[model samples]
Target: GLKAAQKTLFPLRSIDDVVRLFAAELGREEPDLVLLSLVLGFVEHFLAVNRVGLTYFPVADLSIIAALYARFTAQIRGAVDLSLYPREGGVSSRELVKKVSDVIWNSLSRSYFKDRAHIQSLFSFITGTKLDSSGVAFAVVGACQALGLRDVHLALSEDHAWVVFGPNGEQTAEVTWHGKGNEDRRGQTVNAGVAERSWLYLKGSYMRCDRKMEVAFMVCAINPSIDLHTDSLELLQLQQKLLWLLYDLGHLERYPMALGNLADLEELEPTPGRPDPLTLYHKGIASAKTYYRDEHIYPYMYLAGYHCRNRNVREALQAWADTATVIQDYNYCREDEEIYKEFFEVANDVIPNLLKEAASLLEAGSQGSALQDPECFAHLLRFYDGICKWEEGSPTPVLHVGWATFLVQSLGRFEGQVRQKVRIVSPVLTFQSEKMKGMKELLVATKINSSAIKLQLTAQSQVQMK
Candidate 1:
């Protein structure tokens, strides 16, 4: 007020003159400045401007607003651009005007608020009022921008919004709306930091990252049923385990292959302690970035299901193949029975179906050199055949087309050239020698139709036996 009066160098006579002078000072200030400062100074005032009306604590809001204003106007590297001070010696007026405008522009545009503490304080004040989730979400986004956090976005579900801050390299923090706290109001500490912050928004989940591809991979690791079953918990744990294994391998953390630093895992475990569910989650994501890009899937086998669900046949095959490798790792199931059993179920429950889908995609004309490889065929046949023995009530497993197609294509390469005797045998029938009764009866009955079968069928025949 003094600065504003000094800028005009006015001699005030009455209350109306003072009021007019203040109005002139405000007019010199940017609209966004006053709006953001007002919002910061008074939560209800901010809310009212956005058409939100609610009861809130003025003192707390004022303290927050003051701190925020100081933070905003403090000249920093990433602060918003302000107009130049005039040469007519009215710099104080311009400075006063700049204070509110600086915050408004910083909040709405620049990367001014880099620290999480500022954001937490703002939200803490906002939560003081009983605003709806949408209103809270709106305020959070504005606050995020005001604070100058870059790439700020509000992810929405039906009942709530989760504020995504920074897109901070391979890691970002998600702010969830947990609603109001208990009677003491002490339970809800809106402390903002990567690890301490809650990721839940309306009981849904989100992944924070700058790159679209990395975020794509992280999204796969988030289990929607995290609220319902321990399966997601185990799955995420295993995913993290695989990532650690990959990190140790030293091959999974470079360039297009590396998702992020395993060092990020410690961020989720800020305190010196055991890993929590969120820690496991961050670990899973950090490693999942590799899984999503690497040739390995055992680390993130469930990603196969995600890809398969999305009909991403190319990646789905890689996921399945990588998982198969882990399953056959000799000491894999022997080391961790929980992981083994969980993945064993996936082998029987998920892989077979995914392989069939792979076959369908082949039929539908999707292509991959790996999927078409004859070596991959024989390997998968052995894997699925072993699954039949290990799992009771398993389906009569058929080999993937990559195997069959490769063989057929190979046969065509050798067409009309082989004089070798080709024989076909069934695993079930060969084991039941006693039930065979006589080869003559079977061969004679088969011979009448066998020539026609031979005449019609080429290498494409995926013949079956009872």
Candidate 2:
């Protein structure tokens, strides 16, 4: 029923009242729409090797995914936005709806929806109805029909629609119907098909440059949520930690603490065998190596030695051996899931499942182990290969290689105290082929290959009368 209103056109409401009232009114706007627009912006900005179009699906092809993911990665990454409420520095609801709309109609679409079929289908889809390509184009007619956004054009994709949300030649994906759930789980549905399409549409878009601005734009779209089960929660926490930690590392700039109370990161509990909580097992090992190489090797080596001191000699010896194996034949070390469990203990409760998988790969049988315990080296290579495979579309290959090598090397060095036998063999050492020549040169340069193992053995043997 329509409410009766006094028909006086007087400007009765105060600006302050309007401000406060508008804030509440804006809060009523659908969150999914906000998230959808932001995500679309990201897809275009970060991954655009495949142009942002209706026909293309980046998820289907790994190479296309990789190609699209190539943009703005070096300086910026994803933001954690999962909040139900408007966060600080957030755009007002009106502005968000307007700005996002403009982005789609003006910038993203190719032809500005001059085609009628495209508009028709686009409109039909947004209105909880399907339309053909031509019907999609007619979708633009609705926006043009609106008093304010009359000039704004609409375009139709095979499955979605876009609109010029403003008269300023702007583009936007218009909501079909505002979706509503109990102001809680299902806040509001914009349009079922349109909402669904935005995630992919944004997932493949990219920006040519201006990373920070693009990233910030993406950040604004984040929907801060309280649920830990959701990836959003962990990602937000992780992003915050990395941002601040990197800042404190002083490598970038001095960053203020991201998490006010470190204990709040109960979700990010550390794992054993893995020294770094944030890093994967391979990366953790590599980080330890980088420390060994650049800083004091003795500190890390001492820590390795200390693990065995005054502990059960046999157990210590086994632990030490495992560590050494990883150092020489890290891949071989990776095979032993037990050691991975033992080594990567943060507290007792939070070990990640990835460690076991990483260990398994390290133990896989592949070529002549590049490093001694050729099995270990073989696995490390295989582990690296696995990592590369995981990062099939990822841009961090060097990081993958470094982390894969470091895990075993660091662990081996740490376990030196308990480890009585030391053997360092590269995979190529077993090969008596022409390729062995290059391998030989590498060993000679390191001065710690299979030949070094013999010398260490001799010294160990000489210390008999303890």
Candidate 3:
């Protein structure tokens, strides 16, 4: 309380102030997390509104940010009268949490588009507490901090967020409404309607973020869009600056997607004295591999997108295949719309475009080409197969007629010899471990080596079968 009284520093006035503030927030043992988030919310919110002429700059009063924090704490204190259920014995508080959920939940704007900007922060609370899934959940954990309930923290999966408290943080609770929205399950835990195998839960491969990692999420949520094609370069720079700052402070090592977002910005605009985009990509892949049990999908897609843009056909295909492999375990859901776009873009645009270039190389009889290679086709099938498997147990369909036509059209360019060289292994082949993958590559390589010997025999016999 006295820190706010003494310093009175409004950190959102400039990028310089923002970075300096985050720097200080990270260095302190116990940082004011929601306050940091609220400051960020104000600056980011300001950046967007000014571009649209909704508001003017330099009227940036962070005094409201402090008031928001003060008001929440006061409301939290007033609403949860704990005289009846004292905590001197340090017992876990379920009643305390439910009331907190009700506090944040009921304040939300009546309308939907809770996913829109400003809704993801306390600044969203500016007009009517228009919090999205990420925002309200984030508020509950941070509010517990104000209530002096230190046990609560954020449990993040790729598509979901909830609070974890009680002994060992094993106890989980939903404080915010997710995609379909509900009231009854706000305090429900792992025992209920949400399936573990679905993409929503990610089968316990969730991120248990401490204060700094949560700060990383705040930075990651930064939207640079002034529109689709043009963005506020200043806002992009601010997000990148803090991300790189966090990268240096070692806050990024555990969070793969955060680095991927930073990696993307770096790809579009190179930052001098920073590691190149691909280096960030590889590290993102490694973080997902090492920390997430290789469950996160976007890291590989990011790598594949880069390789596809560079026209490195083989590398791109392999990364796409790896993306599918990671996604195989998480069944599809209506709520998985973000990831659906990743796969849709790859299927509808990237792979077809990649095949167009690969076909051109073959027509020219280019040496060392993928159209002559069967393993490239193998990666293509494997990629499709993984996505097909993801759709297997889902409530909705993933690949429809639109996907098939694109695949058929793309595959038509490869010659019959290359097609025949692929045996199109059975479903059992999909179960092969990483160590077993090398043998298939060598097997395909040898098939090409002696293919001329078998060509005459195959050519003579194939006419009747076709």
Candidate 4:
């Protein structure tokens, strides 16, 4: 066992060495994910130190990685109950997954900042129970394989990860916590959340990752930070090459975020012959539409963010509206806080900043400017309305009072001419009541009886500036 482990760790002197190791492992029909994950975590750790001598020497002490592999495999196998395995394949896939999940879950150190980088792998698990949300999901799947359960695989959404298994892989389970210490849903079927169209569940559009796709997950998990503001070039190059390797192998065809990540790196450091970031972002959107049923959000976010950075506000607004449309179908909950933060930033920060051009643009009689365009106004309402619909019948408050203040402020920036060109034409009680009642007589009766509404309705709701 040590011999095999040493061979795996042997090629650690440089980034190319790690790529060779990844290439060999990934080239196999069945990649050794535990070994790959441990190896990646080990290398990412040293490279992040950003010091050559220290980085290269850590490989000499490969026991940290080797011990991690041994401990993970033993604990996983140790917890696996033979009785849960099916006589054919799985009579209780759920139980088997939960058993492994409990192993990772219960061992987590009582109080460690889970948001730490590099804690997202088995290396962290063996060193101590420290894993970011995705790390736990990946670990569970790896553990299932350690027990030779081939059906269990990783299921990923835009911002979350879980597991899927069973004869046809129709079954799904939440193996990890989500959004700031939330889950008793762990090990349970995702149907309840999915049924409500919750964002956390992805409405059955979650990626069912096979082994190589899971390998893509490990690559995506690689963090290159020497600190918040600084990253190691060595680590960055390793991730870039590995992602491209995965891309060329077609591992990213179904993984939209991976493509988005690739596109980001390419933007940071362009590859002359490769597709530009915009093209890659488009590809990610297409991939989501083709396979994930357009339920995933980040691909659109990537495009929206790109558009915003280029001052293509109209395009940005529509892309953002598309994102909101995706979320609108999902009920909000505390577990969905990651997206909440995203929407929070877009609504509060980005929208406000983008709208500041309204007066100057309006002075130019610019119906074509993003602020003056009726269509962008339409896009803006579609954006806000979708978020409001997301709040409907949900326990968690999505649109806080703070959201209201800024939303009204955003709408105010658009000229009345621009906004009034587009109407809020949703069905209202006034229209329904007038349609059913004898119009003139009912109006007279209601006027005589005294109106109850605080703001009395007229035939048209919009007001012209005095």
TM-score of each: 0.24, 0.19, 0.82, 0.83
RMSD of each: 21.9, 23.0, 6.6, 6.8
Q: Provide the clash count, candidate 1.
A: 7
Candidate 1: give the clashing pairs.
33-100, 107-145, 107-146, 111-148, 112-148, 113-147, 113-148
The residue-by-residue lDDT of candidate 1 on 221-306, one tens digit each, is: 22212233323322233234434433443433332222332333333333244444333433444554443332223334444555
| Model 3 lDDT per residue over 1-466, tens place | 4275324556346677778888888888756767777776777666764556534342345567667777767777787676755664464466767788888777776777765655677666655567878888888877777676767788887777888877776778878766663444678785442464666676667788877887888888777676657686777888899999899999999998888899899988889999988899999989988887888887898888888888888888889999989887777875677788879889888889878887877788888787777777778767876777677677787765566557656556566567667773521235333322322443333233233222221222332355
In order, the Cα lDDT scores of the candidates are 0.33, 0.27, 0.72, 0.76
Of 1 and 3, the candidate ranking higher by TM-score: 3
Best by lDDT: 4
Model 4, span 135-219: residue lDDT tens: 9999988887777788889998777888988878888898988777464679788888778777877888889999999999999
lDDT of 1 at 370: 28
lDDT of 2 by residue, 167-233 (tens): 3433344433221221211112234433332311212121111112112222222223323443333
In terms of lDDT, the poorest run of 10 residues in model 1 is 427-436
Candidates arranged by TM-score, highest first: 4, 3, 1, 2
